[PDB]
């Protein structure tokens, strides 16, 4: 596939817009949304060319490792044009002040809002977002060589997207570095988010959502 056509495959893999149709209210809404998005995330991964040719063990390990980072990268893209807001979904738009209503959530909202602000300042483009979301999954913690091949293909596609912007080769290199460096801030926010959710699970204060539970228990 050309990089342009690999990026088109990522565009068609993009999950549909998810709505919740729904303190205790905020946390019920966030866990319900995460469970619904996890179903769509699995269909997305399977549409990444080569992913389903990986070992079932490698397909499971990659989604177990990266699911919270892939959720947070999606939230940042949705939030990019809405300063001060986290666009969880159309019916779940939250700000730092709604975060204060649950212990530990404010911290996570502040991290998500700050990283979103960094992507906003870089003017992150849709096709850059598609490449970095796939790289988050493929770069997470026969089959091994196929995975390095798939990760190289998606890296090549991001380099292509940046090249299409027509900025100097110098500016292309700096832009690639600045995007990839922000993913460590996504990974940090997901480490805090996972810690918080595990604590909420262990206290049984959030509903039994089977796929979410299974993906939490991986950690």
């Amino acid at each position: 596939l050309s990089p342009e056509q690999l990026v088109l495959t990522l565009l068609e893999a993009e999950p549909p817009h998810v709505l919740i149709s729904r303190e205790a209210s905020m946390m019920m809404s966030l866990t319900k949304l995460a469970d619904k998005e996890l179903v769509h995330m699995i269909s997305w991964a399977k549409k990444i060319p080569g992913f389903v040719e990986l070992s079932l063990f490698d397909q499971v390990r990659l989604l177990e490792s990266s699911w919270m980072e892939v959720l947070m990268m999606g939230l940042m893209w949705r939030s990019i044009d809405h300063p001060g807001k986290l666009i969880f979904a159309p019916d779940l738009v939250l700000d730092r002040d709604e975060g204060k209503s649950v212990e530990g959530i404010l911290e996570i909202f502040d991290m998500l809002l700050a990283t979103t602000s960094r992507f906003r300042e870089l003017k992150l483009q849709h096709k850059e977002y598609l490449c970095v979301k796939a790289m988050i999954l493929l770069n997470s913690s026969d089959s091994s060589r196929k995975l390095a091949h798939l990760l190289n293909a998606v890296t090549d596609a991001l380099v292509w997207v940046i090249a299409k912007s027509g900025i100097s080769s110098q500016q292309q290199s700096m832009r690639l570095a600045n995007l990839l460096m922000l993913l460590s801030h996504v990974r940090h926010a997901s480490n805090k988010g996972m810690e918080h959710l595990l604590n909420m699970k262990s206290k049984n204060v959030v509903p039994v959502y089977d796929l979410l539970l299974e993906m939490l228990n991986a950690h």
Binding site: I42, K46, Q59
Partner: peptide
């Protein structure tokens, strides 16, 4: 609970 594997193998 093996919903991840179920979803990885069905469409």
């Amino acid at each position: 609970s093996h919903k991840l594997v179920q979803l990885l193998t069905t469409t």
